[PDB]
Amino acid sequence: SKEDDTLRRFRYLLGLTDLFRHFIETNPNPKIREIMKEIDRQNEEEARQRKRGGRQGGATSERRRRTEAEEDAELLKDEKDGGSAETVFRESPPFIQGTMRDYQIAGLNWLISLHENGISGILADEMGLGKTLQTIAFLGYLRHIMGITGPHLVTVPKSTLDNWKREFEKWTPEVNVLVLQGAKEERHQLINDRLVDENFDVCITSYEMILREKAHLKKFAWEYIIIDEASLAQVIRMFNSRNRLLITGTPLQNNLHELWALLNFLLPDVFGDSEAFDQWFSGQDRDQDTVVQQLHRVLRPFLLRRVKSDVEKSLLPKKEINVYIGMSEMQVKWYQKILEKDIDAVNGAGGKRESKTRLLNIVMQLRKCCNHPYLFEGAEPGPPYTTDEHLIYNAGKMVVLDKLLKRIQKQGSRVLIFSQMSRLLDILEDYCVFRGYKYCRIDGSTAHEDRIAAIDEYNKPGSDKFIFLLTTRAGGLGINLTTADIVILYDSDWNPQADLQAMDRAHRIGQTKQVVVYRFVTDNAIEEKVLERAAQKLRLDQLVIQQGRAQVAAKAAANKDELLSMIQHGAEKVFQTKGAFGTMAEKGSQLDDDDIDAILQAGETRTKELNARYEKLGIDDLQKF
Ligand SMILES: [Cl-]
Numbered sequence: 001s002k003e004d005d006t007l008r009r010f011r012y013l014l015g016l017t018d019l020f021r022h023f024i025e026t027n028p029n030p031k032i033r034e035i036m037k038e039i040d041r042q043n044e045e046e047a048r049q050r051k052r053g054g055r056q057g058g059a060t061s062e063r064r065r066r067t068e069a070e071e072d073a074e075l076l077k078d079e080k081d082g083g084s085a086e087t088v089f090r091e092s093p094p095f096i097q098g099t100m101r102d103y104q105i106a107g108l109n110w111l112i113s114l115h116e117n118g119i120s121g122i123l124a125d126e127m128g129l130g131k132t133l134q135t136i137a138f139l140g141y142l143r144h145i146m147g148i149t150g151p152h153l154v155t156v157p158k159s160t161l162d163n164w165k166r167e168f169e170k171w172t173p174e175v176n177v178l179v180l181q182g183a184k185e186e187r188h189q190l191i192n193d194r195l196v197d198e199n200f201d202v203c204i205t206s207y208e209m210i211l212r213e214k215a216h217l218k219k220f221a222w223e224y225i226i227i228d229e230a231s232l233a234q235v236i237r238m239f240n241s242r243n244r245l246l247i248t249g250t251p252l253q254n255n256l257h258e259l260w261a262l263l264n265f266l267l268p269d270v271f272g273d274s275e276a277f278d279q280w281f282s283g284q285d286r287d288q289d290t291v292v293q294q295l296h297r298v299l300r301p302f303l304l305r306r307v308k309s310d311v312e313k314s315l316l317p318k319k320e321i322n323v324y325i326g327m328s329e330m331q332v333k334w335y336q337k338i339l340e341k342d343i344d345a346v347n348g349a350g351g352k353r354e355s356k357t358r359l360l361n362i363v364m365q366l367r368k369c370c371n372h373p374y375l376f377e378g379a380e381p382g383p384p385y386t387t388d389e390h391l392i393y394n395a396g397k398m399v400v401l402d403k404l405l406k407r408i409q410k411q412g413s414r415v416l417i418f419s420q421m422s423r424l425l426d427i428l429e430d431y432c433v434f435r436g437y438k439y440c441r442i443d444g445s446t447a448h449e450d451r452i453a454a455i456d457e458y459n460k461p462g463s464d465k466f467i468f469l470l471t472t473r474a475g476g477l478g479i480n481l482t483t484a485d486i487v488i489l490y491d492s493d494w495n496p497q498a499d500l501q502a503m504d505r506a507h508r509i510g511q512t513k514q515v516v517v518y519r520f521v522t523d524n525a526i527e528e529k530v531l532e533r534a535a536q537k538l539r540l541d542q543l544v545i546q547q548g549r550a551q552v553a554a555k556a557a558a559n560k561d562e563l564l565s566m567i568q569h570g571a572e573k574v575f576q577t578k579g580a581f582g583t584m585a586e587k588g589s590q591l592d593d594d595d596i597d598a599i600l601q602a603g604e605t606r607t608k609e610l611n612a613r614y615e616k617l618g619i620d621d622l623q624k625f
Pocket of ligand 1: 095125126127128130131488
């Protein structure tokens with residue numbers, strides 16, 4: 001759905017300063033204006049039904065905190081869908097017939113992240129970091145996970161044509177590749193049975209053949225158009241594509257026109273014409289070199305670049321630690337109240353015929369309780385609401401957090417704190433002020449939140465900032481927070497890949513320290529159960545990887561080693577034999593049927609034995625073969 005693509009894209013852009021908002025708000029295209037008006041009026045209504053922060057000791061900031069009802073509806077809706085949809089690979093994917101390096105897996109995950117945010121990107125790794133494999137893995141992700149096979153268009157210099165062809169063939173043989181080359185007669189032989197027929201998943205083309213066949217290429221609604229190393233943009237602009245990838249080996253350059261050309265390539269609906277950009281530049285008040293630098297900063301989320309030294313340096317493994325935590329007396333009371341108000345379902349003695357929605361609501365409330373009792377209306381000590389030390393002691397997690405942060409600051413470390421609930425971050429904001437903690441905050445809002453400003457404030461050398469408060473969703477916005485070295489998951493995502501994505505905001509190339517992750521778990525309550533399920537799904541996930549990779553090898557034609565072991569099997573005993581082999585030498589002619597009844601009996605017995613040998617095994621015992 002391209003209409004939901006636009007929305008997801010626009011919503012992602014609005015946090016990257018007001019630059020994109022401006023080009024959308026004032027966009028020449030009326031249709032573009034409409035969508036922006038829509039998200040605006042929606043943001044207006046949500047602002048009407050929100051307040052700015054009660055607590056007297058509290059945060060003074062201007063964002064508007066959500067209603068208990070409003071966030072309950074979102075958590076519920078989210079629970080109906082098993083959590084975020086995020087995909088994050090922990091290892092080289094089974095569909096890649098080979099092994100990716102750690103930094104290539106990270107590249108893959110970054111490309112995936114762009115795709116799920118509906119944005120195009122630039123892979124600008126230094127030559128030799130295997131950008132081809134990374135791109136191919138990403139297209140493999142589209143195929144095997146998202147059910148998208150193509151059609152994709154890959155345009156390359158003539159010299160690289162053979163390499164792209166081989167790598168597709170090597171890493172993902174199942175992908176149907178069509179290469180456009182040759183004279184005018186060598187083409188029509190391909191076009192009839194292949195090109196015009198859409199008998200391909202991927203079309204690899206030289207820059208040349210793009211022009212000479214543009215008429216046929218324009219007929220397709222392309223998924224991805226990928227340009228390797230970049231009148232090229234003129235023809236590409238006139239192509240239909242859901243997304244694009246630019247593959248280059250060079251960093252961004254201080255050239256205003258090039259930067260506009262990238263923005264136009266990445267966002268052709270937002271930056272459609274050169275004229276609107278020139279008018280924007282002449283109308284604004286920063287000099288050219290400053291604008292150039294602002295454009296670089298804005299292009300950062302759409303660009304991945306790593307140089308050999310980044311890759312050759314070691315990225316320390318993360319220490320992940322679960323923190324098992326009790327509940328305050330107040331938590332105990334509210335937990336009981338929640339369980340009791342639906343005691344029939346909790347006991348589970350009846351029909352269990354109530355809706356799933358009824359059970360989801362319960363789970364949601366228990367989740368809120370394990371977080372902080374103040375999330376419930378009427379729970380916090382009645383008016384006036386103030387940040388006491390009671391704000392800490394009424395929650396088991398707050399008590400542990402409070403001492404943990406104290407110890408984190410002493411050793412001179414900096415911390416990211418993620419949560420599923422914005423209304424919980426609100427409580428954390430107030431707590432931060434009460435302890436005099438300097439902080440930034442990002443929720444992934446489209447209501448005039450500037451995440452570039454906040455990221456930069458946190459990342460500046462000698463920054464005053466200590467804590468960064470973040471929704472777990474914000475972890476999927478491709479942000480870089482390597483200046484922090486400790487991560488606290490205040491509560492967990494039902495999709496472990498979402499939390500992993502969050503940890504990776506700090507645990508990624510550029511990080512110099514050992515990333516320590518603390519996952520708060522309310523012991524002997526609902527959260528510990530979720531924790532076990534998470535570990536089960538992780539093991540299941542590992543098996544399907546381990547097995548799926550063996551399937552690929554099994555499904556495939558024989559190895560030279562496999563062939564050789566076939567040839568050699570029994571070869572000795574054959575060479576040794578001078579007469580006839582065992583069964584034939586025992587007699588020779590058409591002898592006793594008792595020999596036949598024996599052979600059939602021996603055969604039936606050996607058969608049961610050969611089956612039984614493997615029917616019991618699992619893959620690890622199967623690998624011994
Ligand atoms: Cl490369």
